[PDB]
């Protein structure tokens, strides 16, 4: 079946019914230190083409609904990419589409309302709204260099094709 | 006597006809009849119809397929069909030769009766044997063993294009309780093949496009072991694995060409994971087969899973069985492994022997078998003569006595 | 040219013959059958009656308290009408469930036998019946001119384009 | 031995009856052939629906009177039937169903087509029950 | 009967046949 | 008072108390150990019934007849104890019913567990095929009980039925079940003898019959298609059900099933035949059908009809003015089923207070295998 | 298909898939067929002694004696010739074909090659309608057994050639069908002035063959084509040997689909019968 | 003209319970239903399944609120309402073969079920047993029995079998009843005792009963005749030959005055002259100005009446069979009818009864 | 006792075998 996140760790903190798994990320957030060369939005890259088929997904643990989100933002990034005329151009509007406002769990959806929890409190809400903020301008960096080919800065048809496929039929837009 | 017998395996896509002994069917045409558009008509329009490729583009004529599900729909059509098959291609006296003809497993009473009787009323034969599918691949496999053992005990994956199914045999005779169908067959993953395709690939013409689609999937499609790591390979690699193939232009004669790659794996996939495809059905086939197995007898359930035989041309990419026999293994270990560490005298009972057998004699299974049958002198004890059939009458065609 | 007032006849005959009801077994515990059929009470018989056009066309009435048999000579005025009547009759004799009120076999020396249970005149209507009955009559007599003249027709079309290539 | 049956000497059974029979007789010849000759067809009739012999069981005695009946339908037309059937009474239209139903069990000389033609002036008169009492009757012609 | 079609089988594969990444 | 009364069945356990008109208690005969870990250790009748897919579960019963004394204590618990009865076995006399034809060991062993096991006061063991016809009024006559597994027969005469006198037919209820099965797949349709026998169980009880004239069911059969049915099938599927219908219960009569011996109404005539000359014509017209295979439409005409074509060709060697005078009577009441009980809770009702009928714990104690007072 | 094709599907498709691989310098296929043709004709393709290259294509007439009687070894020496080489043990005549060295049009052999059956059947035919060309009035009849029970007899004179088929009907309604089909040959030179005239008996032999075991019968009759110059000249000599030596299959493949049609005709008012029958029950 | 459609298969028969706020019927099968009337709806209230073949005959005692019935499995239950359900007692009517029809007696002490052997079961309560008792009427009986109805006494019991006769007996049970008042049937009535015997040469006989005051007997056979016979007048027999098909169905309505029914479909009206000794066809009562118009039949039938199919049973629902005002028929058609006799008079102004 | 009430709960089964005024 479908590819569940293998990075639980036993001290991992959460913010609402999501793990705060840290990132190697140059953009400021509220994200942890990483020493490592993997994380979170590796292991949704990596996974993206094999899980954007799947319809049903068992969520494992908190780990998963954070690799779920990714998942899903990435598909948005290709709705984007597919029109630009230069990798320099994606990441003008992989910027632009970091600072969209975007819905959280509670808000109307953000259409899986059923399987994520409520930010409560004023410290939950602020946090998870940049820490979603700091997943979307990284994972849109790093799909910046993936997508675009070596030659005339065109988009590859091999990230291109998977545009229309949604994952677990939910979309963000 | 000193003329064999004709042998029809008529199939959703494809029947498959020629004489008894032959290691292979003369012919395989698409089973589909072209007929006339304006259908009250006199003279002898009745007589002009065309079969197989000749009419898979015939100008002024509605082609039409007799055959759905493995089933027949049309009598008429399925009547006039036979009428070329004996007359054009055979060129058999119909007279001079005992017949085999084949019938989905599930055909009942009131199906497989009605079909004897517009052939012995019609073609005046004087014999006919209508078969089953489950024992004749069964049949076909056994030139692989051998040296092993030879019994009509084991499971059957019949996969073509219209349907596919599970089917447990036991010595003989078809439990027709634990049957179980899956949504997935040949045509929905050419349909699939096709679909990714028109998402990434140009040039091809709309009118070719089913064409090459089942070329791309007939000619490269295969099984692997995991989704990512090929993703991974092809994106690593890419090269090495993207394979070009270049068509010809049905209208202006000019060559097009596509990129193969992301649908030479994901294809037969479904089969395993249906969800990609179907909305309908989840299950993969591989917990469709153990789950089959299980609701069969106790005693019968070991035989069944040393003995699942492949059966079809949807079962022909490569590396299929050796994936289907992981699926399994993975599973019905997993399933044992709980009745041991859920019991302690119970726990250990005997690791489940799971063989998927894949003989080069795959796409001419039930042909096959009928082909041997037929050759043999005890056909002509088992077969129903049209004395019988007159005599008696059409009762006669409702069964035959399981020969050992 | 007498075939109206012959169905007229058979139609008020059937009328009067097709009076049933349910009725059990006086001779087999818990047993219900067509008494007509059995006719193991005789009692239950009722005096059978024909109906005759000509030396060649008629219709035999056996009736019951709980079932009729209606039993027709069909107009045969050579053999391959002969024959296509067999050809026809036996066709619709294999068919027979289909038809829940027509019978395995005819009565001997008739073509073709309806054996109608009180089963079938509960759960179908008596006069619709009986229209069926003359509507089919009317019919095989009409399909068995269109196949005769289908014949002879394909073979002048079967004769000619052998000898026009000559 | 099975071929042997037991229901056959069962007590209980439904036996016949008709003992009327003391005697037979049957539509005269001569008295229908004194109104044949003359012309009056309508008196020929009423003579041969006389004394049936419904309780004799001899068969000859029956077709001696069908025969009997039977001249007199035939020498009949169509254009005068309609009058014979209006004079008799409610009991002898009864009667003449029975006789025809009889007749087309012997069908010759296009005698058939105008039985059918009788057959229809006396359903008019005596209407489907006058053919139900021919199906119902136990001793019959 | 089934040896027919045995027996016969046997006398084809005397001439008819005479012509890791994956688990554990 | 204070009685008690237990028909242990092969299928249901029917206990109550003496006088009563139903059985109070009617529930699988049946014990069920679990196979993994609110679930006891053991469930009993209706408990293991409802778990069944869950527990490896056992019949003592086989036949009627004894084969596991353990877990046949566990279902006697079940039954006095409280989910049932809730009785003191100790301050309560008990009828049972001695099962058709069992070797005396199993006899005794029973005896020997009431007043050993459980203690009572009083215990009594009736005939199953004799308080089958107290019911109905009788004290010597015959019984012909076709059930689930054989169909046996017993005269008796004036309540004690003599042992000899009793045979068995090899044939009865899973039989014809089991040959309907081959029936149906000569008809053309892929049945299992072990998979579907539960399927064509229903159909044979909802379809089939026993036909008073072979002669004639088949030129109805073959003839005409009145016979054939629709049946709807679990999975869906239809099939048609024709002459089969009478085909298979007609085993009981007819070598059919590869079963030596004369089918049930020939070995009637055969046994009635071997009896004193007076007692002949008492057990002729005292001929008592019951159990299950009996309710077949037909079966009582079926079987009159036959003994008439015997005592005909086999008791008057042709003749007929003999026969009038054959008197006979087969009665088969309405409620064939279960009539043991019913029999026994009367019985063990009207002798509950007299002194010389119910063998006691007292004397057991004295043993003399005193358990059988002839 | 009104008229039966002549050439056989099975030789020519196994030769031009054969030989289109050759062309292409592919390695050589295995090869073995066992397969048939109308009146008893056996056929069987293969490579003798395992050799790939090498494809024997035999067939097998149970009366090639007869035929070999009246000069079917050199026709068939003109029209294969190097092709044609000693017969398969057990078959009558032997092609060979090899894969090394084949001519560049290639439809042409494999047209040839089809025909194997039909110039079989063409020798007797030849010399009969030569006879009647020179003149040679007089001559005696041949009688081929072309199946167990029916005889064609062949008959030169003066100005016609005469050629009678003695054919038989199993099935007992076949006859009758069988009739109707010969009547209309009867009438049958309204079309053509120029037509074969076609004369037709139903049990006793004609005129003509008198005697010599003539077979009587109810399920046997006699068809007669007298053929002429016309129909007989070499400009029309293949057309009409290839209509005439089918014509016997072509009647009851006839027969047979005519009973196929009567079939959907039954169908539909079998169908149109239980719609009035239905309408009766009220929901 | 009040027509109801229960269902589409037949009702085999119907009881109505005192005040006719309840009707029994069985849907052509083994269970019999009880529908209460609320409003203008009919409303199913109870389900009688104890029976294992059709049911054939119901009857509702009015006084004591009890049904009984009878069915093709050979047993009779009467049913008792206990609390909010009905509750069956087995009697054995000790018959070999199918019950065939079942009529309480007017005072309600005993019940004559209908046998298929050549019987007459005569079924009373035995009160120290708790048991229902039945004593059985043999001779001169040779065929099936087929509709029963009492005379207003109790004792006397119309019968009409497939015997081609009528016949009256008497069924006194001394057990249970004072001695009989002689009437103009006879004297002598000892139980089993043949006080009449119709004629008739054949016919079959489907329905019977007794005049209001019980001095006449009328009844329908399947050879289209209705015929009655008056005890004042030596049992002289009046008979009626029809034009049309059988009668199935019988009933006074007033003492000289018959409303018959069967496979036409509609109820028919008959008189009886006392005086002239003959019996009258007063005609159609089931009448189709708007009718006469299209009428066009919805495809979905052509046909007309109160009825689409022959009418089995026809039952008085209030005035007795001596002012009958208000009666019901069940037939095939799965339809119950209710018609009123002054609308019917209002309606056919020339119609007249008596 | 026993044979003493048994037999009259038969005679309703077995059964199957001063007027003037
Ligand atoms: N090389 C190949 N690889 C994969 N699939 C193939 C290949 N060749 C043919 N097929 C598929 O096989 C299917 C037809 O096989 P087959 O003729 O055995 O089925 P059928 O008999 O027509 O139908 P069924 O057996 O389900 O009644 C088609 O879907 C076709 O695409
Ligand atoms: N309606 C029916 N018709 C025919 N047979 C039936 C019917 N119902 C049950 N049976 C059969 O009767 C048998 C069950 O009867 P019963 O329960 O009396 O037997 P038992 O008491 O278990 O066995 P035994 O009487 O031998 O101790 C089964 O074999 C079953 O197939
Ligand atoms: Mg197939
Ligand atoms: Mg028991």
């Known amino acids: ?173 | 006597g000193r003329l064999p017998a004709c042998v029809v395996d008529c199939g959703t896509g494809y029947t498959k006809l020629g004489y008894a002994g032959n290691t292979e069917p003369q012919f395989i045409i698409p089973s589909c009849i072209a007929i006339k558009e304006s259908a009250v008509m006199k003279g002898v329009d009745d007589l002009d119809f065309f079969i197989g490729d000749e009419a898979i583009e015939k100008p002024t004529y509605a082609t039409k397929w007799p055959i759905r599900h493995g089933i027949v729909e049309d009598w008429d059509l399925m009547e006039r069909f036979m009428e070329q098959v004996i007359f054009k291609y055979l060129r058999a006296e119909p007279e001079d030769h005992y017949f085999l003809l084949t019938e989905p497993p599930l055909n009942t009473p009131e199906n497989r009766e009605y079909t004897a009787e517009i052939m012995f009323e019609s073609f005046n034969v004087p014999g006919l044997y209508i078969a089953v599918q489950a024992v004749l691949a069964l049949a076909a496999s056994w030139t692989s063993r051998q040296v092993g053992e030879r019994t009509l005990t084991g499971t059957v994956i019949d996969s073509g294009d219209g349907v596919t199914h599970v089917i447990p045999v036991a010595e003989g005779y078809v439990i027709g309780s634990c049957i179980k169908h899956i949504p997935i067959a040949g045509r929905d993953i050419t349909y699939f093949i096709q679909q990714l395709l028109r998402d990434r690939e140009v040039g091809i013409p709309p009118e070719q496009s089913l064409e090459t689609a089942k070329a791309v999937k007939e000619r490269y499609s295969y099984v692997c072991p995991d989704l990512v790591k090929e993703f991974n390979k092809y994106d690593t690699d890419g090269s090495k694995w993207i394979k070009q193939y270049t068509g010809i232009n049905a209208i202006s004669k000019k060559e097009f060409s596509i990129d193969v790659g992301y649908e030479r794996f994901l294809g037969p996939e479904i089969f395993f994971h249906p969800e990609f495809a179907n909305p309908d059905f989840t299950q993969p086939i591989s917990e469709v087969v153990d789950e089959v197995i299980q609701n069969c007898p106790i005693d019968v359930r070991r035989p069944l899973y040393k003995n699942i035989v492949l059966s079809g041309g949807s079962t022909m990419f490569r590396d299929f069985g050796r994936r289907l026999q992981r699926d399994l293994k993975r599973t019905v270990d997993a399933r044992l492994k709980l009745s041991e560490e859920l019991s302690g005298g119970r726990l250990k009972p005997k690791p489940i022997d799971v063989q998927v057998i894949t003989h080069h004699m795959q796409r001419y299974a039930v042909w096959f078998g009928g082909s041997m049958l037929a050759s043999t002198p005890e056909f002509y004890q088992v077969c129903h003569t049209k004395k019988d059939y007159e005599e008696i009458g059409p009762s006669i065609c409702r069964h035959n006595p399981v020969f050992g | ?166 | ?141 | ?24 | ?374 | ?283 | ?354």
């Not at chain 1, 639980?8 to 490592?36: C, H, V, W, Y």
């Not at chain 6, 003994?307 to 006979?328: A, H, M, N």
């Not at chain 7, 090869?31 to 490579?47: C, K, Q, R, W």
């Not at chain 8, 009160?127 to 040779?142: A, F, G, L, S, Y």
């Open chain 6, 1 to 374: 008072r204070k009685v008690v009364v237990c028909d242990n069945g092969t299928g249901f356990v029917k206990c109550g108390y003496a006088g009563s008109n139903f059985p109070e208690h009617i529930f699988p005969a049946l014990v069920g150990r679990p196979i993994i870990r609110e679930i006891k250790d053991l469930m009993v009748g209706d408990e293991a019934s409802e778990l069944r897919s869950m527990l490896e579960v056992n019949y003592p019963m086989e036949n009627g007849i004894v084969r596991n004394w353990d877990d046949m204590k566990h279902l006697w618990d079940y039954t006095f104890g409280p989910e049932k009865l809730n009785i003191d076995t100790r301050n309560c006399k008990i009828l049972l019913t001695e099962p058709p034809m069992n070797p005396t060991k199993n006899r005794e062993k029973i005896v020997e567990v009431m007043f050993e096991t459980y203690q009572f006061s009083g215990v009594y063991v009736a005939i199953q095929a004799v308080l089958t016809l107290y019911a109905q009024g009788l004290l010597t006559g015959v019984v012909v009980d076709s059930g689930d597994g054989v169909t046996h027969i017993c005269p008796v005469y004036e309540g004690f039925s003599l042992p000899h006198l009793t045979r068995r037919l090899d044939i009865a209820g899973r039989d014809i079940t089991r040959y309907l099965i081959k029936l149906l797949l000569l008809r053309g349709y892929a049945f299992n003898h072990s998979a579907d026998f539960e399927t064509v169980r229903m159909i044979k009880e909802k379809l089939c019959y026993v036909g008073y004239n072979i002669e004639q069911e088949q030129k109805l059969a073959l003839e005409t298609t009145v016979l054939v049915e629709s049946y709807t099938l679990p999975d869906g599927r239809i099939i048609k059900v024709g002459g089969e219908r009478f085909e298979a219960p007609e085993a009981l009569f007819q070598h059919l099933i590869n079963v030596e011996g004369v089918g049930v109404a020939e070995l009637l005539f055969n046994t009635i035949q071997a009896a004193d000359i007076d007692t002949r014509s008492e057990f002729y017209k005292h001929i008592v059908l019951s159990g299950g295979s009996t309710m077949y439409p037909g079966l009582p005409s079926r079987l009159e009809r036959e003994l008439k074509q015997l005592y005909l060709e086999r008791v008057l060697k042709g003749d007929v003015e003999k026969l009038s005078k054959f008197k006979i009577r087969i009665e088969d009441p309405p409620r064939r089923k279960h009539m043991v009980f019913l029999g026994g809770a009367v019985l063990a009702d009207i002798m509950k207070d007299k002194d010389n009928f119910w063998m006691t714990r007292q004397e057991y104690q004295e043993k003399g295998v005193r358990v059988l007072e002839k």
């Open chain 4, 1 to 141: 031995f099975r071929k042997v049956d037991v229901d056959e000497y069962d007590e209980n059974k439904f036996v016949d009856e008709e003992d009327g029979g003391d005697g037979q007789a049957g539509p005269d010849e001569g008295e229908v052939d004194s109104c044949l000759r003359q012309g009056n067809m309508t008196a020929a009739l009423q003579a041969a629906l006389k004394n049936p012999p419904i309780n004799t069981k001899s068969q000859a005695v029956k077709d001696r009177a069908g025969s009997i009946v039977l001249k007199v339908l035939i020498s009949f037309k169509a254009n005068d039937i309609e009058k014979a059937v209006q004079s008799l009474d409610k009991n002898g239209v009864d009667l003449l169903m029975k006789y025809i139903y009889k007749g087309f069990e012997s069908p010759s000389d296009n005698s058939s087509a105008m039985l059918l033609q009788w057959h229809e002036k006396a359903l008019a008169a005596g209407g489907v029950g006058s053919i139900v009492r021919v199906l119902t009757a136990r001793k019959t012609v």
């Open chain 5, 1 to 24: 009967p089934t040896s027919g079609i045995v027996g016969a089988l046997m006398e084809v594969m005397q001439k008819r046949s005479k012509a890791d990444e994956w688990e554990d």
């Open chain 7, 1 to 283: 298909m009104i008229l039966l094709e002549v050439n056989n599907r099975i030789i020519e498709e196994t030769l031009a898939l054969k030989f289109e691989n050759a062309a292409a310098g592919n390695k050589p296929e295995a090869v073995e067929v066992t397969f048939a043709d109308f009146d008893g004709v056996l056929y069987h393709i293969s490579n003798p002694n395992g050799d790939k290259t090498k494809v024997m294509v035999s067939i097998s007439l149970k009366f090639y004696k007869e035929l070999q009687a009246h000069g079917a070894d050199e026709l068939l020496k003109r029209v294969y010739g190097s092709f044609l080489v000693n017969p398969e043990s057990g078959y009558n005549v032997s092609l060979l074909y090899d894969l090394e060295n084949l001519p560049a049009s290639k439809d042409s052999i494999v047209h040839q090659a089809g025909m194997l059956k039909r110039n079989c059947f063409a020798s007797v035919f030849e010399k009969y309608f030569q006879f009647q060309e020179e003149g040679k009035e007089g001559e005696n009849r041949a009688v081929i057994h072309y199946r167990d029970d029916e005889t064609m007899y062949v008959e030169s004179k003066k100005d016609r050639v005469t050629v009678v088929f003695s054919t038989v009907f199993k099935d007992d309604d076949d006859v009758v069908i069988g009739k109707v089909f010969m009547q209309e040959f009867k009438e049958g030179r309204r079309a053509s002035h120029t037509a074969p005239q076609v004369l037709f008996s139903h049990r006793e032999p004609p005129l003509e063959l008198k005697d010599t075991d003539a077979a009587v019968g109810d399920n046997i009759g006699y068809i007669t084509f007298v053929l002429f110059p016309r129909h007989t000249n070499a400009s029309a000599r293949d057309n009409t040997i290839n209509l005439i030596h089918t014509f016997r299959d072509y009647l009851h493949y006839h027969i047979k689909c005519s009973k196929a049609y009567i079939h959907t005709r039954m169908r539909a008012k079998t169908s149109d019968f239980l719609k009035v029958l239905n309408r009766a029950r009220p929901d």
């Open chain 8, 1 to 354: 003209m009040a027509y109801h459609s229960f269902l589409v298969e037949p009702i085999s028969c119907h009881a109505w319970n005192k005040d006719r706020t309840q009707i029994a019927i069985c849907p052509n099968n083994h269970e019999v239903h009880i529908y209460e009337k609320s409003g203008a709806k009919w409303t199913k209230v109870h389900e009688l399944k104890e029976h294992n073949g059709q049911v054939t005959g119901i009857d509702w005692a009015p006084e004591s609120n009890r049904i009984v019935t009878c069915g093709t499995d050979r047993n009779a239950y009467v049913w008792t309402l206990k609390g909010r359900t009905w509750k069956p007692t087995l009697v054995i009517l000790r018959i070999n073969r199918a019950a065939r029809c079942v009529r309480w007696a007017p005072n309600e002490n005993k019940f004559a079920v209908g046998s298929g052997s050549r019987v007459i079961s005569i079924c009373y309560f035995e009160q120290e047993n708790d048991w229902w008792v039945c004593k059985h009427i043999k001779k001169p009986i040779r065929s099936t029995v087929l509709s029963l109805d009492w005379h207003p006494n109790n004792v006397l019991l119309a019968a009409g079998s497939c015997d081609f006769k009528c016949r009256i007996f008497s069924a006194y049970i001394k057990e249970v009843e004072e001695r009989p008042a002689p009437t103009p049937w006879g004297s002598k009535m000892p139980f089993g005792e043949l006080m009449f015997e119709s004629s008739s040469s054949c016919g079959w006989v489907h329905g019977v009963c007794f005049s209001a005051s019980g001095s006449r007997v009328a009844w329908v056979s399947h050879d289209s005749t209705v015929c009655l016979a008056d005890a004042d007048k030596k049992m002289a027999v009046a008979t009626l030959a029809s034009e049309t098909l059988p009668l199935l169905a019988l009933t006074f309505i007033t003492d000289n005055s018959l409303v018959a029914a069967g496979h036409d479909c509609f109820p028919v009206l008959f008189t009886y002259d006392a005086a002239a000794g003959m019996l009258s066809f007063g005609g159609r009562l089931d009448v189709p100005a708007r009718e006469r118009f299209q009428n066009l039949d919805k495809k979905a039938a052509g046909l007309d009446s109160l009825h689409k199919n022959s009418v089995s049973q026809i039952s008085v629902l209030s005035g007795g069979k001596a002012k009958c005002s208000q009666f019901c028929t069940t037939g095939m058609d799965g339809g119950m009818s209710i018609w009123d006799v002054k609308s019917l008079e209002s309606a056919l102004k020339d119609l007249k009864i008596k």
């Open chain 1, 1 to 173: 079946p479908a590819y569940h996140s293998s990075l639980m760790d036993p001290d991992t903190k959460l913010i609402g019914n999501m793990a705060l798994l840290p990132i190697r990320s140059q953009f400021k957030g509220p994200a942890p230190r990483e020493t490592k060369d993997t994380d979170i939005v590796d292991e949704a890259i990596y996974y993206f083409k094999a899980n954007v088929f799947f319809k049903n997904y068992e969520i494992k643990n908190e780990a998963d609904r954070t690799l779920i989100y990714i998942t899903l933002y990435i598909s948005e990034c290709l709705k984007k990419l597919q029109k630009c005329n230069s990798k320099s151009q994606g990441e003008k509007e992989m910027y632009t589409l970091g600072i969209t406002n975007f819905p959280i769990p509670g808000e109307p959806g953000f259409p899986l309302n059923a399987i994520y929890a409520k930010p409560a409190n004023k410290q939950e809400d602020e946090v998870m709204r940049a820490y979603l903020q700091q997943l979307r301008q990284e994972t849109g960096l790093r799909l910046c260099e993936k997508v675009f080919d070596p030659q005339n800065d065109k988009p590859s048809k091999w990230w291109t094709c998977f545009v229309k496929r949604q994952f677990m039929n939910k979309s963000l837009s």
């Open chain 3, 1 to 166: 040219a007498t075939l109206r007032p012959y169905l007229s006849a058979v139609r008020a005959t059937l009328q009067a013959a097709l009076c049933l009801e349910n009725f059990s077994s006086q001779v087999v515990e818990r047993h219900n059958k067509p008494e007509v059929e059995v006719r193991s009470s005789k009692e239950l018989l009722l005096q059978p009656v024909t109906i005759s056009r000509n030396e060649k066309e008629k219709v035999l009435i056996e009736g019951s308290i709980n079932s009729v048999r209606v039993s027709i000579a069909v107009k045969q005025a050579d053999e391959i009408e002969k024959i296509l009547c067999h050809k026809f009759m036996r066709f619709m004799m294999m068919r027979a469930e289909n038809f829940f009120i027509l019978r395995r076999k005819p009565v001997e020396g008739y073509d073709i036998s309806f054996l109608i249970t009180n089963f079938h005149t509960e759960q179908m209507y008596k006069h619709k019946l009986v229209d069926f009955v003359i509507h089919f009559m009317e019919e095989i007599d009409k399909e068995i001119s269109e196949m005769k003249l289908s014949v002879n027709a394909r073979a002048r079309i079967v004769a000619e384009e052998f000898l026009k290539n000559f």
